[PDB]
């Protein structure tokens, strides 16, 4: 009959929705549209 021995503890350190703030963690006026028209950018 072995002696009674302590069980490992894990719940305390078991514990990113729970961590807040993890969700979030040049040409001329004419050129800006017509460059996208030809897919230049």
């Amino acid at each position: 009959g072995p002696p009674k021995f302590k069980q490992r503890q894990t719940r305390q350190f078991k514990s990113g929705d729970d961590i807040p703030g993890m969700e979030g963690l040049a040409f001329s006026h004419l050129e800006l549209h017509e460059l996208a028209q030809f897919g230049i950018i």
Binding site: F5, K6, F13, E34, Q37, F38, G39
Partner: protein, 771 residues
């Protein structure tokens, strides 16, 4: 009161230990109260907690007035341990209350084990546990009042008044010890983290670093760690004897995940005598750690096991004598399992006898459990290191197999470098570079009959193998092979591999790369812009022009970003241009393909920089950003009265040469607009098809509406959008070049004619929709 005051002042002075051991001051107070109570053999039972089970242990025995402290002190070798369910000291520690029991033989909690051990008769004893912060530190014992029974309530009052001093001393020692253990914990964590973050390593090296670094803060005489085999399944051919039943299945110790308990490596840290580290691969079962069942018991079960007086146990076969002939014997043992994130036991750490010789208590259990927990967390680094090595190896294999597949076979070389048909060697390229030059220079088409210098040249009549031949001819005409010592076989091979690295896409195929390289050649020679560039720079620009769209998949940078392609997650900006640059450099990495092998280190550093600037300068967003700076360069170069002054002005400034080279590479990319209407109409059909299949990919895979340029539904709107491409992007590159040098004047003429035709079809569309 005067002698009572003197005794109080003596107690106040002995409370001021100023160093030493508090057991001395407590012993002096205990002998004081012993002579005061008319009682003998006062005692202290320290409370320990092991495995979460509380116990009491006698620390000072046979306290007598005028007795020497050395005889009253009992060491842990002779201490008598009682659990809280044995003895009235156990009941007192449980209840935390004052008890006064006469005729202890009538009490249901009195234990005579100490009375039998010592042969002393006890009749009446007083018990009061010392309790601070709800925690019980010691049970104080007053026994066998002489000349009187039942003690007295005033004896209890003076007993409490002296146990106030006892509690003071014990609380001071408790605060000092809790500070010591918590400092040891924090230093252990700081050192283990420092050693874990030093680099990525496998389990063995990282655990060895951490444990060896923290060895000084664990007051163990020795300790070890055993790592279990982590393999979970076997190969089918090693299951075959088991499945056939030719071998009986393994039976014996098994971890909870079911793996076999095989310690594949043991690390011993011996600290009692000489500090020595032993690494034992595949240790036998006779190993002095494994010979006791305790490490294996932890591997099967996973408990933290504190076992005092381990050779007195019956279950575990702990060695009762020296194990290394050095005279070290096992006395106390504390074993803990290291676990994965999945609770899988990777190893078992066993800490042996404490340096102080006291049995392990909950404090050292706490220290070793926090170390073991940190080690079990550290395995993320090992798993990441293994995944790094596997990803690296798989990448290198895939890149080598790709490069082997793409590289031109020796037949493809012999198809052009017809050395076999002219030198009669057929076995070895032992012929000198002059011989290879002489035999090849016949086989290329002459550049005048092919019109390769002319801005008009159309690639439709030529075959793609004729395009390779013409490409080597263009390299010959710049006169690069003789100056930079570019071998002719590696030249032809590199041209063929560059061709084969262009995909069979409708417009970004090898013909587009060849026409861009021919535009680079003709701008250099006939446009006379080579006056600004060294022949080394001309060679680098022509190679970059031939590779500026290498392995272009057939899609736009917007498509790569929208499709979240590996190219887009690898290269943050100029995604395809950086891919073309990376792949052209990869082709130049092979000695077989390095047409720049015979350069100086600084010349390659120069060639690589020209490759970078030219290919990233094939990004039209960069072109649009730097148009204004090129225009300022041309305007400043126009007022110069002398051609040689203009040459000086451009050549002295590296950045102006880089901007002009970027502008040349954009004139080269969009050259088709300047080609005759037949060629322009075909090439515009090719880009329109490429853009249509891009828009079909966008609508089908990405499920988004394409821009009208990408949309097949706006097919008849093609020429009007072509007109819009003619004014916004090409006139400037070409008008400013015609101002810069009049020799590029006809390229604007070609655009002007082509614009009229593009306007004509738009008017034909104006006729069509209005009716």
């Amino acid at each position: 009161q005067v002698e009572e005051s003197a005794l109080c002042l003596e107690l106040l002075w002995t409370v001021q230990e100023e160093g030493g051991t508090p057991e001395q001051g407590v012993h002096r107070a205990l002998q004081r109260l012993a002579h005061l109570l008319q009682a003998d053999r006062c005692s202290m039972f320290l409370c320990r907690s092991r495995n979460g089970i509380p116990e009491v242990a006698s620390r000072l025995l046979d306290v007598t007035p005028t007795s020497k402290f050395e005889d009253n002190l009992v060491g842990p070798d002779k201490e008598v341990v009682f659990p809280l369910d044995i003895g009235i000291v156990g009941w007192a520690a449980h209840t935390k209350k004052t008890h006064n029991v006469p005729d202890v033989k009538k009490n249901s909690h009195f234990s005579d084990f100490m009375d039998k051990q010592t042969g002393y008769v006890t009749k009446n004893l007083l018990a009061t546990p010392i309790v601070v912060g709800k925690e019980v530190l010691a049970v104080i014992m007053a026994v066998n009042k002489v000349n009187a029974s039942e003690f007295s309530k005033q004896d209890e009052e003076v007993f409490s008044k002296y146990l106030n001093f006892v509690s003071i001393i014990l609380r001071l020692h408790h605060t000092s010890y809790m500070y010591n253990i918590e400092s040891r914990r924090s230093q252990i964590l700081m050192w283990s983290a420092n050693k874990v973050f030093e680099e990525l390593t496998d389990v063995e090296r990282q655990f060895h670093k951490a444990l060896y670094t923290v060895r000084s803060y664990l007051n163990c005489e020795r300790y070890s760690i055993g790592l279990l085999d982590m393999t979970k399944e076997k190969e089918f051919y090693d299951e075959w004897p088991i499945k056939l039943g030719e071998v009986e299945p393994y039976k014996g110790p098994k971890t909870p995940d079911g793996r076999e308990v095989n310690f594949y490596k043991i690390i011993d840290y011996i600290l009692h005598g000489k500090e020595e580290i032993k690494v034992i691969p595949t240790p036998p079962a006779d190993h002095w750690t494994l010979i006791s069942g305790l490490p294996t018991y932890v591997a099967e079960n996973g408990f933290i096991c504190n076992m005092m007086n381990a050779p007195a146990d019956e279950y575990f076969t702990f060695q009762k004598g020296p194990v290394d002939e050095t005279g070290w014997v096992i006395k106390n043992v504390l074993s803990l399992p290291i676990v994965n994130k999945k609770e899988d036991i990777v190893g078992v750490a066993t800490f042996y006898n404490r340096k102080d010789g006291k049995p392990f208590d909950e404090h050292d259990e706490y220290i070793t459990e926090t170390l073991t927990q940190f080690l079990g967390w550290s395995l993320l680094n090992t798993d990441t290191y293994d995944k790094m090595n596997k990803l690296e190896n798989r990448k290198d294999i895939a890149q080598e197999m790709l490069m082997n597949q793409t590289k031109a076979t020796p037949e493809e070389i012999k198809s052009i470098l017809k050395f076999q048909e002219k030198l009669n060697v057929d076995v070895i390229d032992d012929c000198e570079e002059k011989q290879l030059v002489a035999i090849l220079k016949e086989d290329l088409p002459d550049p005048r009959s092919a019109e390769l210098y002319e801005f008009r040249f159309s690639d439709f009549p030529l075959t793609e193998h004729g395009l390779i031949k013409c490409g080597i001819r263009l390299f010959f005409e710049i006169n690069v092979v003789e100056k930079f010592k570019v071998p002719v076989e590696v030249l032809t091979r590199w041209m063929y591999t560059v061709r084969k690295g262009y995909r069979a896409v409708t417009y970004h195929n090898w013909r587009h790369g060849f026409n861009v390289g021919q535009t680079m050649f003709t701008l250099l020679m006939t446009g006379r812009l080579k006056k600004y560039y060294t022949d080394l720079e001309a060679f680098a620009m022509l190679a970059a022009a031939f590779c500026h769209d290498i392995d272009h998949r057939g899609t736009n940078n917007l498509y790569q970003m929208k499709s979240t392609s590996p190219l887009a997650r690898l290269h943050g900006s100029s995604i395809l241009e950086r891919h073309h640059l990376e792949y052209s450099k990869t082709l130049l990495q092979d000695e077989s393909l390095n047409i720049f092998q015979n350069l100086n280190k600084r010349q390659f550093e120069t060639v690589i920089h020209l490759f970078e600037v030219a290919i990233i300068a094939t990004d039209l967003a960069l072109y649009f950003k730097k148009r204004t700076m090129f225009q300022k360069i041309v305007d400043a170069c126009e007022q110069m009265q002398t051609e040689e002054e203009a040459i000086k002005y451009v050549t002295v400034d590296p950045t102006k040469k880089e901007i002009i080279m970027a502008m040349m590479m954009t004139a080269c990319d969009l050259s088709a607009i300047t080609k005759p209407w037949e060629v322009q109409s075909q090439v515009a059909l090719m880009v329109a098809n490429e853009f249509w299949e891009q828009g079909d990919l966008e609508r089908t895979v990405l499920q988004q509406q394409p821009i009208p340029m990408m949309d097949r539904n706006k097919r008849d709107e093609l020429p009007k959008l072509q007109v819009g491409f003619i004014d916004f992007v090409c006139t400037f590159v070409y008008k400013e070049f015609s101002r810069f040098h009049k020799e590029i004047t006809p390229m604007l003429s070609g655009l002007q004619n082509n614009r009229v035709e593009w306007k004509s079809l738009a008017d034909e569309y104006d006729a069509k929709m209005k009716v």
